[PDB]
Amino acid sequence: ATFVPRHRRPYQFTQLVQLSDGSTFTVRTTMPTALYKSAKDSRNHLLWQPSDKSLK
Amino acid sequence: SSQIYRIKSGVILTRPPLLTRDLTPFEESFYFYQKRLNERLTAPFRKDFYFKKDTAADLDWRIKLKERHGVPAKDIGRYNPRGRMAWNDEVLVGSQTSSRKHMVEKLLADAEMRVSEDGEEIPAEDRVPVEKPMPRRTEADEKGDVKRLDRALDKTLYLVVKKKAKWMFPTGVVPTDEGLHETAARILAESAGVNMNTWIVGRVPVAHHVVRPVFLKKGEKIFFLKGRIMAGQADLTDNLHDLVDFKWLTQEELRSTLAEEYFHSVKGMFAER
Amino acid sequence: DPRIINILRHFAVLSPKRIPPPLRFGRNRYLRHWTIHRAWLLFRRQQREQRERILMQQHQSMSNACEELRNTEGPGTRETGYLYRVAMLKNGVYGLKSIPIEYASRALVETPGRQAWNHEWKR
Amino acid sequence: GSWLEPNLNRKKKMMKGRPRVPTGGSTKGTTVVWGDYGLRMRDHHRRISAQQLKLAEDTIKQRLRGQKYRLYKRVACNVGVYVSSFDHWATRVAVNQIIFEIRGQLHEQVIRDAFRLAGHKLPGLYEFVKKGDPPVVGITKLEDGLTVEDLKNPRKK
Amino acid sequence: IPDLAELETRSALDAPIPSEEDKKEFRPWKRAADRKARLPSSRYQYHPPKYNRGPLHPIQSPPSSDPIARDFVPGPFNMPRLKETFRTVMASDLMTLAYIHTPPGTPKKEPTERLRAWEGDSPYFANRARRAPRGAPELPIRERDISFRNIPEIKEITVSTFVPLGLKNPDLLIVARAVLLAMTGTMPEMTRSKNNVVQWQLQANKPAGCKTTIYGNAAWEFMDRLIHLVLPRIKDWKGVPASTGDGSGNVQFGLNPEDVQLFPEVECNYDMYPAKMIPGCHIAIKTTATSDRQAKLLLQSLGVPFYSN
RNA sequence: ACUUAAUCUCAGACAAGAUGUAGAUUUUCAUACCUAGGUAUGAAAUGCAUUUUUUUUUGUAUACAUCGGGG
RNA sequence: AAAUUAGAUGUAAAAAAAAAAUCUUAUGAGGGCGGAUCCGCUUCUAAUAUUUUUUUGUAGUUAUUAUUA
Ligand SMILES: NC(=O)c1ccc[n+]([C@@H]2O[C@H](COP(=O)([O-])OP(=O)(O)OC[C@H]3O[C@@H](n4cnc5c(N)ncnc54)[C@H](O)[C@@H]3O)[C@@H](O)[C@H]2O)c1
Ligand SMILES: [Mg+2]
Question: Looking at the record, which segments are called Disordered (chain E)?
Answer without folding.
Answer: 1-66
